[PDB]
């Protein structure tokens, strides 16, 4: 959308998930900087009325903030000159049974915005856990249209944020732990009409492939593999749901994103490479046809779901040629850089030297070289595999500084033991089939159960890490960077933090009410710069605390790894907004009073 490109150029706005179509989470503002950040303090706050995990970040457009919640998925609009008055609210009615088929807490990753065309007014776009998609009038909150995407009666839910491109809205999928076959969908943003739908497994007609799919890289695979790398009809319940993030390039007209894990977790019940689960895709925005597809993890044995963040850039390669690029840190312990015009592989390096599941990734063949001592199989208990199923990276949205050519990544340090078991498939019931034990990696404290996270600065062409720092818990929610020489991020023990962009030195922190699992955002209003973040712990690391669990193998193995989290935080739900010296809308305290 050309009008969204123009609105994103103003520092008074934050108009889409990831700030801009490159998805870099980067601001040119420098009012707040490494020389004055000690003066940063709260300006105003807002509670959402709900508990459980609060993921994503707010939107800001035309002098207003738009806020979203955990289940039952409420929406609020606030005016920035008087945020104590709620302009409008949307409160959906949903079947309480949706809660029982959610794998990993009652979370939602956020809102999108479409600017209007003179006939249809500007719109806010949202998902619901029960599988409905809705368009709301941005000025009044009234429902313009609503449609069914996903069915809870077969185990299928929604947690992903919508994404707007041209006059279309893109919607993903959840439920591989219940045997759901993945698909993504494009709708007409004005009416709700279905324009195209593409599946992750099965016959080529259902995959929606271009006539020249992978013509630059035929060794990645081409026709017939969505059924040829499976035995019989096991692809019908085969996984590959997409629940993470997108990027977009108007010059190629492609959206970029990853597909998730195959089902069940028991590898012995599904022989074959299981395509096109675990795959980096480039698809045309108007027809959905795939130009390229690269499978990162053939025949998954570990639950390394391939859904993580996409970040675009333009850099010289090692031979000195200018390249248009995408960069992508995966659950499996590898960070991938590809040419975004044709799919060619440029670099594939370890997130940390303790990864042992693969020896390396071969850049000429594209296959990961497996170490068989760290595989899984029936009738065998596998021990000390790194990464764990929680990954060395999960759902957090990271950032990129274009002048420094550095990526700022929030990382996990968690390893595991694993054994599978045989089980039947019944639609509507869980279909996992493995038992796990999880604990800190070799650079943490495996007997006190602390040292479970890292934050690092990275160059994608040389592969060098500029700096690396340990954290008490996994850095789950992502990062945001600015031209004031600062990197901002939230933590599970309940802080907003800032580090120096060149060295990693800790410069500032504030104790917020509950742990953070979303990313920070920034904007100006009447000349003043503000920084905002959600609070409210949850998601996979919080299941022990949220559901009052004690067996370490419960929560798919997450309860044992995070047993100390309850000693540092409790549940919550809301937003905290910061500025220099805490300057804000009530500096005249008579504004917003009764008279």
């Amino acid at each position: 959308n050309d009008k969204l490109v123009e609105l994103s150029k103003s520092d008074d706005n934050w108009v889409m998930p990831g700030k801009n179509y490159d998805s870099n989470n980067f601001s040119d503002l420098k009012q707040i900087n490494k020389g004055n950040v000690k003066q940063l303090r709260p300006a105003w706050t807002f509670s959402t009325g709900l508990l459980n995990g609060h993921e994503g970040a707010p939107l800001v457009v035309d002098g207003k903030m738009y806020i979203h919640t955990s289940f039952p998925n409420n929406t609020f609009a606030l005016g920035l000159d008087d945020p104590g008055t709620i302009l409008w609210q949307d409160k959906p009615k949903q079947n309480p049974a949706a809660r029982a088929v959610a794998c990993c807490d009652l979370v939602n990753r956020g809102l999108a915005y479409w600017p209007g065309d003179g006939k249809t007014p500007a719109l806010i776009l949202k998902t619901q856990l029960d599988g409905n998609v809705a368009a709301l009038n941005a000025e009044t909150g009234e429902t313009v249209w609503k449609v069914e995407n996903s069915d809870i009666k077969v185990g299928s839910t929604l947690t992903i944020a919508p994404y707007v491109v041209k006059d279309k809205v893109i919607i993903g999928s959840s439920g591989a732990e219940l045997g759901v076959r993945g698909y993504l969908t494009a709708y007409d943003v004005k009416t709700g009409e279905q324009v195209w739908r593409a599946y992750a497994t099965g016959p080529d007609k259902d995959l929606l492939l271009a006539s020249d799919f992978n013509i630059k890289n035929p060794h990645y695979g081409q026709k017939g593999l969505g059924t040829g790398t499976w035995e019989g009809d096991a692809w019908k319940i085969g996984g590959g749901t997409n629940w993470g993030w997108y990027a977009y390039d108007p010059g190629t007209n492609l959206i970029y994103f990853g597909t998730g894990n195959p089902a069940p977790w028991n590898e012995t019940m599904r022989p074959g490479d299981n395509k096109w689960t675990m795959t980096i895709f480039g698809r045309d925005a108007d027809t959905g046809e795939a130009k390229f597809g690269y499978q990162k993890t053939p025949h998954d044995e570990w639950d390394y779901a391939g859904v993580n963040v996409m970040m675009l850039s333009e850099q010289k390669d090692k031979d000195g040629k200018a390249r248009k690029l995408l960069t992508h840190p995966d659950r499996n312990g590898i960070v991938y850089t590809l040419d975004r015009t044709d799919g060619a592989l440029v670099s594939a390096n370890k997130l940390d030297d303790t990864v042992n599941v693969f020896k390396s990734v071969d850049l000429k063949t594209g296959q990961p070289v497996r170490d068989p001592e760290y595989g899984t199989r029936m009738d065998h208990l596998a021990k000390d595999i790194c990464p764990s199923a929680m990954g060395y990276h999960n759902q957090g949205h990271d950032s990129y500084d274009p002048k420094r050519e550095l990526f700022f990544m929030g990382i996990n340090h968690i390893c595991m033991d694993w054994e599978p078991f045989m089980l039947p498939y019944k639609a509507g019931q869980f279909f996992v089939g493995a038992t796990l034990n999880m604990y800190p990696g070799p650079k943490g404290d495996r007997q006190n159960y602390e040292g479970l996270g890292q934050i690092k600065a990275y160059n994608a062409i040389t592969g060098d890490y500029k700096w690396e720092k340990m954290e008490r818990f996994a850095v789950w929610g992502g990062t945001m960077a600015t031209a004031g020489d600062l990197v901002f991020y939230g933590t599970l023990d309940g802080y907003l933090k800032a580090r120096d962009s060149d060295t990693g030195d800790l410069l500032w922190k504030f104790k917020i009410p509950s742990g953070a699992i979303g990313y920070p955002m920034t904007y100006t209003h009447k000349g003043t710069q503000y920084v905002a973040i959600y609070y409210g712990v949850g998601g996979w690391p919080g299941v022990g605390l949220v559901f009052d669990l004690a067996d370490p193998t419960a929560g798919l193995g997450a309860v044992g790894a995070f047993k100390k989290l309850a000693n540092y935080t409790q549940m919550g739900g809301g937003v905290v907004v910061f500025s220099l010296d805490g300057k804000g809308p009530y500096d005249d305290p008579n504004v917003g009073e009764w008279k």
Binding site: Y220, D233, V369, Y425
Partner: protein, 72 residues
């Protein structure tokens, strides 16, 4: 099985030592019910048909109705 032996482009899977090339008839056979396998595709067809009734009525009348029993 180290992932580097491929009988065709994009098809590199091999069985681990002591395991079979095919699981049908073996002690690892999942024995799936064909009628359970087909339930999620039948559900998607029923959602797509209800949504088409809602969208065509919105374009013709200019008023959105979600309950398809109220659409003539």
């Amino acid at each position: 099985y180290d992932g580097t032996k491929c009988k065709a482009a994009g098809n590199c899977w091999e069985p681990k030592p002591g395991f079979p090339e095919k699981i049908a008839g073996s002690k690892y056979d999942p024995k799936h019910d064909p009628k359970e396998l087909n339930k999620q595709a039948d559900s998607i067809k029923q959602m797509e048909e209800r949504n088409k009734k809602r969208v065509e009525n919105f374009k013709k009348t200019g008023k959105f109705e979600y309950d398809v029993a109220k659409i003539s």
